[PDB]
Fold:
Amino acid sequence: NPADNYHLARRRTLQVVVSSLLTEAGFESAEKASVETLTEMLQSYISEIGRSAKSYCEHTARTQPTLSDIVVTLVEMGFNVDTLPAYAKRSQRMVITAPPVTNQPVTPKALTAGQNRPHPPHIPSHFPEFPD
Amino acid sequence: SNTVLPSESMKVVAESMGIAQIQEETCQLLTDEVSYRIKEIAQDALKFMHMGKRQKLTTSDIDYALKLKNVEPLYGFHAQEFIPFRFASGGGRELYFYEEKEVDLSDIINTPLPRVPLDVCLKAHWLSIEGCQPAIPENPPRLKPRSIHELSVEQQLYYKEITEACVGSCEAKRAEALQSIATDPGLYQMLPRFSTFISEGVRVNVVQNNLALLIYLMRMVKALMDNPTLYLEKYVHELIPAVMTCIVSRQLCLRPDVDNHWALRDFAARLVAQICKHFSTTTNNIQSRITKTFTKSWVDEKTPWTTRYGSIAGLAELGHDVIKTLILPRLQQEGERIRSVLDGPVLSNIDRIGADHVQSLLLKHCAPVLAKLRPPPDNQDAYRAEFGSLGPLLCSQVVKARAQAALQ
Amino acid sequence: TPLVDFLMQLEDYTPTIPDAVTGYYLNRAGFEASDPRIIRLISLAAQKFISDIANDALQHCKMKKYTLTMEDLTPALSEYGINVKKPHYF
Amino acid sequence: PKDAQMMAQILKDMGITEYEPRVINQMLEFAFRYVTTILDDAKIYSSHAKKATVDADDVRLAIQCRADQSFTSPPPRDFLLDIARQRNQTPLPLIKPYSGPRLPPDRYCLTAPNYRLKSL
Amino acid sequence: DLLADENFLMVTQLHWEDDIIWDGE
Amino acid sequence: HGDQECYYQDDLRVLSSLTKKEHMKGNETMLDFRTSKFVLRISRDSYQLLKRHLQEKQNNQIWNIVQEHLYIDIFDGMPRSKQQIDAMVGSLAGEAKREANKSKVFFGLLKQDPNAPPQNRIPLPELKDSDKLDKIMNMKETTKRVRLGPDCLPSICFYTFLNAYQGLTAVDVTDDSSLIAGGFADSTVRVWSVTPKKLRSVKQASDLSLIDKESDDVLERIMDEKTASELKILYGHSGPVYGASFSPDRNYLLSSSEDGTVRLWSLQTFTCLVGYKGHNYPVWDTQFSPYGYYFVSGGHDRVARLWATDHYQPLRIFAGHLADVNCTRFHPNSNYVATGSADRTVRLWDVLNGNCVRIFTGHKGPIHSLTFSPNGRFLATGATDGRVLLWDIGHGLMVGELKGHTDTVCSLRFSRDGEILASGSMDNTVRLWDAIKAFEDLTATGHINLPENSQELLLGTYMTKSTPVVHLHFTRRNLVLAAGAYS
Structure:
């Protein structure tokens, strides 16, 4: 059901990556409530550098954030960006598959065949045609 | 009403924290205050539901109602320093009452990544054409005078075009017509004339065995059935007989070549037979008639082998239990029939082609019966107790099925 | 400047979190995918955060193995100033 | 559960027939969060008066403190009507014939050269 | 039971084997 | 609480939770209800029986509560019927005084009309000769536009949002069907072109200045063909975009959201220009002026601000409502702002002096839809009770009531001639009302004894397939456009 699969779409994908990171020099068979806790702190962390680095750049009259807006955002959160080079040096990391597209055929919609009727002059040509 | 939370839940929370020996008036003090806050937020989350016009509610109205009351919407952790998690929410905790409380880490990687749905797009239609709502799929639903037909002059032209397209002169025409038969909401009140055209057609179309005319009519029946708007069980007295003669009649055309063609019509007939019965099965009537007639057709002696093959197919596609009870005590008879065709040098008949098709179909159905409720063992010569028809090749088919199961 | 020299080496290096998933949660907050290397840096930062906690509670799991539990996440996040909550209502 | 079945009756007494999949689960999570911050503050003030058995004065002090730190509420009507009449007294300014795209001063807009890094 | 409208469904009141002429004269 | 009227049921359940003084303090709404006075319009024939039961000292305390907490506004006339009192009550501080609805309102259109304000009353923007060229092709549309009336019912073209798993929260269309905005719950604004003409973003300042200027064909030239889509997504709100408003020159999209900011998006560069931070609270609506300079935004902080796209601070603060300002609509002369709200009142505000000049009470739920007549003489309001109440502006007598809809009426619009009012609700219906037979008749008593003309005024109902009608628009050729996310 794609209606409720809007947020589940990449939340269960996040859970796949969470498992990989909790096994990276980590434990096994995690408590269920401890995984939905930590992936709630992960979503709230990406959403907080989203709101605060946008606020720091728009305070400086800009619209898209540079590197100097995130290294002040992470300072105000307490993280340090100079630990990322070392984390990449660690060859201990993996890669997760991207979620598949819900509709493979893009736009297969061909409506129906049976054109009939025209348009009265108060309806321009760019509105849909009158049906059969 | 001022229905508060229970106080016997508030003492459990207090003594599981280190605060023991709390009075009842101390414990009641919390319940009235806590219930008001839940009541203050749910009345305030109602603002976001009415203003977002959400209605179905996406996990998030309480996150904005909490942020509106200057409380963190965070659920499952509270930061006293407030800086890594400000009033941005984390989407709650996906927790249940009937949960396992301890899963495997490998299980959450096995959890498939759900599909990101389609993005929001603008499509246009018509609610009203000069006052009248169209029936498009984007919309919900003593001399005397002479009488008029109950069909419109257009509806009658539509019926003529759909029937002249459904006799399959062009694939595009037939396909579009079949789609229209399976989707038209106003195709009721034309349905007697479609049922009569089908029924009458098959009966004067088996006088000369015209396979396309029949394959097109069976596809028309299948397109009539999956239409959700129309009411069909007032017309299956004209439908079942058509599918019956498409399965149990004398078909004396090309022995091997037309067998392939008429076996596709057989597949269509057996499938549409069950779907027709599914739309009306109450007690006995249709299901009882089908079972008794199929059994009598099978137990017929010196039966036309085309009729035999068609009735065999129809009996086979009836589901799980039907072959579990109806395809058991006749295994010896099936083997005897194949042996009778094998003896002799006559190959210009359809009896041999009929025999090979019947044996292959019966052997495949036996394979799930062997797989579903038996364990494989002695696959070399035990099948010689069942006249030795498929034997080791049947065993190899069972092994291929087991390999497919292992792959699954 | 090491961190500028680091980000210029990310035209490849596909990280654990895919950029279709890191970029989804960035687009949810207004951050749009101008440069894909910046998306990969955000992904690496999120990975580092989680991996740090996992290695901080490893010592707590040795004290009380190698089975992640909520009583291992509780002292691991307590030095971070984060009080994790038990479910207790299911 | 015990406390989760009472939460489905608080919603049904408010006429909420169908809401969110887990809304009962997170109103119980808020109700638990609210009572473990009243009672946590109740024993803080109990120790302020050197007492173990929490009575009601410390708990009431905890209730008022929780409202003060958070719930500040939308500004009141006597505050909104004072800043209105202080603002609505100033007359409307005139405009210029060809001012151009009418915008605030450039330190109040979001129109800057908007740079980034380099792909080297 | 007997007044139940399904009973009077023409499919549940008609035997199909007799309906088909089946090349019989 | 059991012997109350049925339309007070959502009001009493907020009171069943308020068992404490501190609980009332949080609401602020009951804090302003306790300090204000209920107006309670009663007749002099019934007030004589009331005062002959209260001036005696046998009761002597309920009379003290009445003369402390209740105003009583007396009119000389017939006592109203029960189904007429039911039509004009339902608001806290309900049934406001007639001395509020007697101020002179310039409800006429600009350019003689004696009800029209002067052009220099509100300092509006200037006009050009290209603007006189616009009205020449506007009346070509008026030729094809048909006096809709009760006979030539209009055709409705529903531009439904199909997938929309991002929770459509807002929709807006330009005067001419050309650009349709979409405010969504994933904090995005998405502009769609509906004409066969793609949305052209521009190369940039270092790039638009070299395409040259003064050519006279530069307006087409400045648009870049490298950037040409049928859809432009706008990012920058940190919350669901509740409001969406185009400017009449088809630039300058406006959007307001939960994060407390109003944003001015360009439609020539397709970037954000200004973020107007005056509310700390969810801004539920915004709208540009019909002349395109000022705009009004109403939020959760119970005010509506008047901005001017030139100042970071507002010019007028309309601060008389007791609950959230749900809707904010400009008058067709843009001298008056109508603000519907969640305390079941609609209030007209003069742009000069910021004064409330009209108070329209009689809705039972929070007002979610507001619309002015093209004459400027009438105002249609819709709320969660499914009632569309037609108000006079020079009088303020609640002239009509349309009670066909079931759920929240979330969109209203009159025709371009004024012949038909179109109503769209959460019942998934687009009802058409006769907006000429509703105002045909149009004081000293404050009411006109309105009839049950709803059945006669209905022209069609037009049930929609599982789709709440979020927006209603009328093309300049009198063609109804509607846009709702398909659920």
Q: What stands out?
A: Chains C and E do not touch (no CB pair under 8 Å). Chain C is about 55% helix and 0% strand. The two ends of chain C are 51 Å apart (CA to CA).
